[PDB]
Amino acid sequence: MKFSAKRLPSTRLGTFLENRVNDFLRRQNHPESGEVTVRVVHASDKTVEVKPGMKARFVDSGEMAESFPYRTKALFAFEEIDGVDLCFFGMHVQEYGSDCPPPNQRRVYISYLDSVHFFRPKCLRTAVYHEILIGYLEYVKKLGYTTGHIWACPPSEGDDYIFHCHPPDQKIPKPKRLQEWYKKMLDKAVSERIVHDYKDIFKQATEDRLTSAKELPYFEGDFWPNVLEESIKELEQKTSKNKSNDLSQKLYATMEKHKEVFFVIRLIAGPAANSLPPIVDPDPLIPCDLMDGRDAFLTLARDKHLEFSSLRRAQWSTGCMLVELHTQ
Ligand SMILES: Cn1cc(-c2ccc(NC(=O)[C@H](NCCc3ccc(C#N)cc3)c3ccccc3)nc2)cn1
Numbered sequence: 001m002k003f004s005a006k007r008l009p010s011t012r013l014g015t016f017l018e019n020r021v022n023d024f025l026r027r028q029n030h031p032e033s034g035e036v037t038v039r040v041v042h043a044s045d046k047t048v049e050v051k052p053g054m055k056a057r058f059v060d061s062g063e064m065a066e067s068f069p070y071r072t073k074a075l076f077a078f079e080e081i082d083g084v085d086l087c088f089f090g091m092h093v094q095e096y097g098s099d100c101p102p103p104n105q106r107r108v109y110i111s112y113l114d115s116v117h118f119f120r121p122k123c124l125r126t127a128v129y130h131e132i133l134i135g136y137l138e139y140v141k142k143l144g145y146t147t148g149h150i151w152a153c154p155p156s157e158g159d160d161y162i163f164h165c166h167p168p169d170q171k172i173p174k175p176k177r178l179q180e181w182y183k184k185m186l187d188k189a190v191s192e193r194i195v196h197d198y199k200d201i202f203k204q205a206t207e208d209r210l211t212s213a214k215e216l217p218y219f220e221g222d223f224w225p226n227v228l229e230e231s232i233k234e235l236e237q238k239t240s241k242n243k244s245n246d247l248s249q250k251l252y253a254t255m256e257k258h259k260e261v262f263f264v265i266r267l268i269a270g271p272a273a274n275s276l277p278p279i280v281d282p283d284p285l286i287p288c289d290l291m292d293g294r295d296a297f298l299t300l301a302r303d304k305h306l307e308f309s310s311l312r313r314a315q316w317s318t319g320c321m322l323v324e325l326h327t328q
Pocket residue numbers: 113114115116129153154155156157158159160161166167168169170171172173177178181
C-alpha cells in the first residue's frame with residue numbers, strides 16, 4: 001500500500017523503539033517473525049488541573065501549582081504477517097518535562113496500553129511487549145526523565161482501552177498476573193541497567209519521607225487525584241465538640257492498601273539526577289484528532305465496524321486505521 005505503516009512519518013522515538021525490537025527479533029532468528037514498525041501518531045501539549053478539594057487546600061494558599069503541563073503521545077507497533085500489516089500494540093503516555101513544577105518534574109506516566117494477541121510467533125509476544133516498554137524507558141531516561149509511573153490495572157470484562165472488540169479468546173489478565181508481568185519487564189530493565197530500581201508507591205512515599213499530599217505526583221486520569229478529592233470530602237464532614245496532617249494519614253492508609261498496583265520506576269538515581277541539563281524533546285508536535293486520547297479511535301472503529309477480533313479482521317482494521325491517519 002501507499003497507505004502502509006512504514007509510510008507514516010518517522011520520529012526519533014519511534015525509530016529508537018523499532019530498532020530495539022527488530023534487533024531483538026533478528027537475534028532470535030525465528031522463521032515465523034516479520035519486520036516490526038513503530039510509529040508515534042500523536043503528540044500534543046496539555047495540562048492537568050488540580051481538582052477543587054486539593055486546589056482549595058494547596059493551590060489557593062500558594063503551596064502547589066494550579067496545573068501541570070505535559071506532553072501526550074500515542075504510539076503503535078505493527079508486524080508484517082503474510083505480507084500485510086497488523087497493529088498489535090498501542091500506548092498513550094504523559095511526559096512532564098524539566099519546566100514542569102514539582103512534584104511532577106521529569107516524570108513519565110503511562111496512561112493506557114493495549115494489545116491484540118496475533119503477534120507471530122506466540123512464544124515471543126511477551127518479549128516484544130517488554131522490548132517496547134523497556135525501550136520507551138531507556139529513551140526517556142536518555143532525555144533526562146528521572147522517574148516512570150505505572151498503574152497496573154486491567155480493563156474490565158468486555159471493555160477496551162485502545163482497540164475495539166478484542167478476540168473472544170484473548171483473556172484479560174487478573175491483577176496478580178499483570179503485576180507479575182510488569183515486575184518481569186522491570187527486572188529485565190534493571191539487569192540491562194536502564195532502570196536503577198523500582199518500588200511500590202507506599203514504599204517509595206515512606207523512603208521519600210512524604211509528609212503532605214502536595215508532594216505526590218499528580219497525573220491526568222490517575223487514581224491518586226480522585227482518592228485525594230474523596231478523602232478531603234470525608235474529612236470536611238467531621239465535627240468535634242469541645243475539650244491537621246489527617247489527609248496525609250488517609251493517603252498513607254490508601255497507599256498501603258493498594259501498593260501492589262502502583263509502580264514507581266527510578267531511571268536516574270544519586271547525584272546524576274540533580275545536575276541534569278533541561279529536557280529537550282527532539283521530536284515535533286503531531287496534531288491528529290483521531291489519536292488525541294483513546295476515545296476517538298474507539299468511536300471510529302464502532303462507526304465503521306472495525307474489529308480486532310480475528311487475524312483477518314484486525315489486518316482489515318489496521319489497513320483502514322492507516323488509510324484514516326494519512327487521510328486526516
Ligand atoms: C472479549 N474481550 C476481550 C477483552 C480484552 C482482552 C484483552 C485486552 N487487553 C489486553 O490484554 C492488554 N494487553 C497488553 C499487553 C499485555 C499482555 C499480557 C499481559 C499479562 N499478564 C500484560 C500486558 C492489556 C492492557 C492493560 C492491562 C492488561 C492487559 N483488552 C480487552 C475484552 N473483551
